[PDB]
Amino acid sequence: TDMKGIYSALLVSFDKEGNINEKGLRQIIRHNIDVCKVDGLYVGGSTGENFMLSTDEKKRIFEIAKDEVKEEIKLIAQVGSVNLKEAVELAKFTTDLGYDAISAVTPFYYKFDFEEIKHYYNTIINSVDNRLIIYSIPFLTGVDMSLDQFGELFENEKIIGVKFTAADFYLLERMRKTFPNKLIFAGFDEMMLPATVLGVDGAIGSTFNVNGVRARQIFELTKNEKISEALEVQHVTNDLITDILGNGLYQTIKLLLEEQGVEAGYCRQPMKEATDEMKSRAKEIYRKYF
Amino acid sequence: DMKGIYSALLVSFDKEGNINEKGLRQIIRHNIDVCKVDGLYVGGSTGENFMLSTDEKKRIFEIAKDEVKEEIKLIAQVGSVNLKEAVELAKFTTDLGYDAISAVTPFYYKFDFEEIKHYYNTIINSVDNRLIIYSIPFLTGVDMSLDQFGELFENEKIIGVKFTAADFYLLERMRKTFPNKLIFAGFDEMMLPATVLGVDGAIGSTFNVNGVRARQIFELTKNEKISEALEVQHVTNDLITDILGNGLYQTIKLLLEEQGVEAGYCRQPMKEATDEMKSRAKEIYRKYF
Amino acid sequence: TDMKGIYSALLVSFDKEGNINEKGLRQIIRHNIDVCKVDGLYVGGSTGENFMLSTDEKKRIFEIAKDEVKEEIKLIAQVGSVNLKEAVELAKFTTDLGYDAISAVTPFYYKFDFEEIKHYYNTIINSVDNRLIIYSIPFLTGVDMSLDQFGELFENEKIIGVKFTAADFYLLERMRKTFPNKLIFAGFDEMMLPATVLGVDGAIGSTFNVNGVRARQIFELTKNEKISEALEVQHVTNDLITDILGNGLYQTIKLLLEEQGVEAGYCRQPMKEATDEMKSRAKEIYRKYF
Amino acid sequence: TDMKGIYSALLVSFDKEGNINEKGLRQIIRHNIDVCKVDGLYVGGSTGENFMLSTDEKKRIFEIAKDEVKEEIKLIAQVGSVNLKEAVELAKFTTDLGYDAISAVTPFYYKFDFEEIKHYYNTIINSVDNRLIIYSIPFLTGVDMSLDQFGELFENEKIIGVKFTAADFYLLERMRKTFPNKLIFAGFDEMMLPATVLGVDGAIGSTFNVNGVRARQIFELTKNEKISEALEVQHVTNDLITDILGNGLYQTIKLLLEEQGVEAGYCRQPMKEATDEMKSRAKEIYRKYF
Numbered sequence A, C, D: 001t002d003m004k005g006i007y008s009a010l011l012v013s014f015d016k017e018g019n020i021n022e023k024g025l026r027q028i029i030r031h032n033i034d035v036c037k038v039d040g041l042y043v044g045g046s047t048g049e050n051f052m053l054s055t056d057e058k059k060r061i062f063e064i065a066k067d068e069v070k071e072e073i074k075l076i077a078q079v080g081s082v083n084l085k086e087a088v089e090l091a092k093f094t095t096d097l098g099y100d101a102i103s104a105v106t107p108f109y110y111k112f113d114f115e116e117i118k119h120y121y122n123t124i125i126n127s128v129d130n131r132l133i134i135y136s137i138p139f140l141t142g143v144d145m146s147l148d149q150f151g152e153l154f155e156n157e158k159i160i161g162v163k164f165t166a167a168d169f170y171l172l173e174r175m176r177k178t179f180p181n182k183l184i185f186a187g188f189d190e191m192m193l194p195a196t197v198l199g200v201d202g203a204i205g206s207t208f209n210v211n212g213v214r215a216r217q218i219f220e221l222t223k224n225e226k227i228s229e230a231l232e233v234q235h236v237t238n239d240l241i242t243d244i245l246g247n248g249l250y251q252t253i254k255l256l257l258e259e260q261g262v263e264a265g266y267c268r269q270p271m272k273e274a275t276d277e278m279k280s281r282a283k284e285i286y287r288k289y290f
Numbered sequence B: 001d002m003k004g005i006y007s008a009l010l011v012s013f014d015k016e017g018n019i020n021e022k023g024l025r026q027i028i029r030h031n032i033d034v035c036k037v038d039g040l041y042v043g044g045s046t047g048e049n050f051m052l053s054t055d056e057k058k059r060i061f062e063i064a065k066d067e068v069k070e071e072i073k074l075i076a077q078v079g080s081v082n083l084k085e086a087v088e089l090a091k092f093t094t095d096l097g098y099d100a101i102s103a104v105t106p107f108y109y110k111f112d113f114e115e116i117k118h119y120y121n122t123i124i125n126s127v128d129n130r131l132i133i134y135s136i137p138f139l140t141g142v143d144m145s146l147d148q149f150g151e152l153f154e155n156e157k158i159i160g161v162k163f164t165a166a167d168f169y170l171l172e173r174m175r176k177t178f179p180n181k182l183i184f185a186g187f188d189e190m191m192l193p194a195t196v197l198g199v200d201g202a203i204g205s206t207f208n209v210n211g212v213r214a215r216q217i218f219e220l221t222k223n224e225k226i227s228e229a230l231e232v233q234h235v236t237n238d239l240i241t242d243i244l245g246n247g248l249y250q251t252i253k254l255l256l257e258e259q260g261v262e263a264g265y266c267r268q269p270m271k272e273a274t275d276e277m278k279s280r281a282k283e284i285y286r287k288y289f
């Protein structure tokens, strides 16, 4: 399966008790496919509140997404974890479900050296008949890998690409040039335009759950070299992202979906519950950009 | 009373990464009988806690309690990015008889102060126990202020904090401002300066093998024998430096193995000790023990 | 004078004793005008090793630059430093010499709050009849200005722009959209293409002293929407920048200039004199990209 | 001259326009000697606002300090800066004046490596018949050298010590143990007690300009192992430092001096001036601790 394209980092619906709301999750999935019209879904990433869930919950979500999607669009499973045993188990689980590729965040919390990180990735991908995408996001893990390290990881032909969610466009350009045969995904929604001109093969973002159409436009307009128009869409997109971040990122995106009849529900505690003020702000945000 | 020296309990894992109960019980016995610490801090970073499944975490808590019984004090670190898991673990360890629980600041996601406060309140209000705050900016990237620490202490069931910041200015301020809260030093290599500033004890990974020297540092300081305490800290830091340069958790386990304690391996992706690491560990053992 | 365009952050020539080489300095200047074809020069910047020079040396440099350039190209004078009195004196000196605009880096070393930084800029520009460009460079200063703070500075109609040398494209995009009437200069040579797509009004770079032609191609191809081409020029540019950084930034740029027929000379101590290995490496870099 | 003990990082008095106020400087000096009774003065440091001054001004201050002090107490001259040429010049000037030792901060702004930092220190000390103390400042310069390099620097027998103005107590302890034959000075006023417990040979602080008596008590009492007694003094001193820090460090220390008849004058812009409110607050601090 060709993995290039726009992927929404799937959000998950939870009830007030923190339990998964399958009805709501399937509505979020339907929204992304039918309305946002994205090329695929990145399941189990940060946006899905993955690291706040139990292994059983992660697996349940993986099942629901595969089931609801069927074979309509591509699916990437983020199976990374500080627990390498769990990562391998999730890798096998998602591979057996039929996910088109897997992805793994660099092991965090503890301070692993490159030899250990390489062991982590190889152990995961060598345990399954699938393809792996490296997930960096130095912003949250604190793990900043160099070009030569990535080059050593890319040694493995099953490690087909990387999701770069760092603000280093120098390294991004260097990776594009050095690894012309690997896939490079942008993970920073508010910087999609400058990433696309550097040659990324697609994008994976949390805001695509509600802004998938514009996000696709920024990408396609740039590939068509209509930079002026692409910039304008990025400007509008960033006005939206700025308002969302100021009102609480995940809570606001979920409230935007609720406005459209998608029961995205609550966020997992300790992520705060939306106040009446955040709710009112969400409505104004919706009226301004949708 | 919870004051004193606590070893952040290391766990014995085998080649496959599985818990080795026999080895774990030997590590516990070594800490009590040889290191002579006042208690164990179970489920912390040192125990490789965050690389484990909830089931394994629970087994370790039960084994530790069973082996220790009432011999020394026990604090269970139940913190997690998964608040539901933390609550389950807080209840489980409270039912087991743990003297207190502790919780690292939720990490990975960037939670604001309001959310961190809810996190802590949710955990301790769920059980009939007492809570110690675990603040480790070095691994989590979260550093609070004196004012914030104050709002948290509004919950009477939060009785203290494990300090792991190199900011002794903050430590000095907190000691005088909250003389009724427990403050634990979490940086083995800076135990002496922490003790002179009033910490009520220490929680460290190196005490698994260096508990006697750790106690001397603490007690000498309390008795104003600062010069002698500094010398013990010098030798202790020579050891800590060798261990850090040779692989922290792996080397402590090798040092225990040298004494017949089956401490075993660390869970992958933490590397297995190479031959060079094993040889170095023998040199280290000969020089400091 | 319209200040849009490509500016070379002028390097200065020094002998082995660390004394200014006037002929060399004039050759660098002439090289930028006649060979690099830049729109102007940014004099007194970090690249000119400004902060390692005495106030009198700074003045001689400003005089030589103006005398040599005359009116052929535009001139921007960086007059900032930790010493404000010196800054105000230099703003006067350069304004009287006829510099088209002045620039001022955020005061560093000490931790000045925003009010102090704001007064620093107003004091400087209000002291003369000129226009000022802000110079952030958070990479070497540690000062991180927010969008709102930039808005406070831009209140002064004489503060016409900013040299953005921080790799935060989110803030850059926000700046472009929020201040459409101000000039925004890119200060990251290795990220020229992505910055240009975000609408910058030009670029001020240290590598333009030897790579002015490609820099212009990147900027112009981009403005013409020929992105595939721009990316290829940026790839070669970054291969060069990568080699330069690995061999010693300033030393290698001067050695490259030497190979271009310019007596760039030595860097001032404690910046190391190029070793034999560095010298043969610089010549390899020369044969490779020039 | 043995250089152990308490040293006030000499504050400098300036007039409205920022020019040196020699009458105020000599009064500050006399205060440090006669009232604070310090072991010596550290001239040309950050506290002296040195890095906001020109070479000529730095020279005048060194002359003023030497002339006013005569031989009553020890003097250390900080001659470091980004410009090595100025450093050597000041090292010679100061040695001719009879300063007991010189000090040099690690060159900042630019990102120098160890080899260059080494050449910098050796060049300075090999040029004069004096002794050198290394100045770190990891907080303002961002230079955090390791134990192995410091060891290399100390290979030169005329490099007698180092000034630790960073709370890294692990490195401090390592330095003490590794170099029992070198001097180590604590540069963090609020943590001089735990630093003394770790074996420092003295302290260099900005608050000693007005709190030299308590500072000496803390140092000596801790040296004598009278911890509980040293702690009592540290309790009050840190309450004092907290009030000073909250009202404006340099401004408040100068206001506390004025309360005692010392015309400490202004601070050098862009540093904010002392307001009526800061004056009122400083008066309360004065009544509470003096």
Ligand SMILES: CC(=O)N[C@H](C=O)[C@@H](O)[C@H](O)[C@H](O)CO
Residues within 6 Å of the ligand: A145, A146, A147, A148, A170, A171, A174, C242
């Ligand atoms: C190892 C290193 O520090 N850099 C890598 C080159 O080898 C790449 O990441 C690029 O050179 C990059 O520009 C700097 O990291």
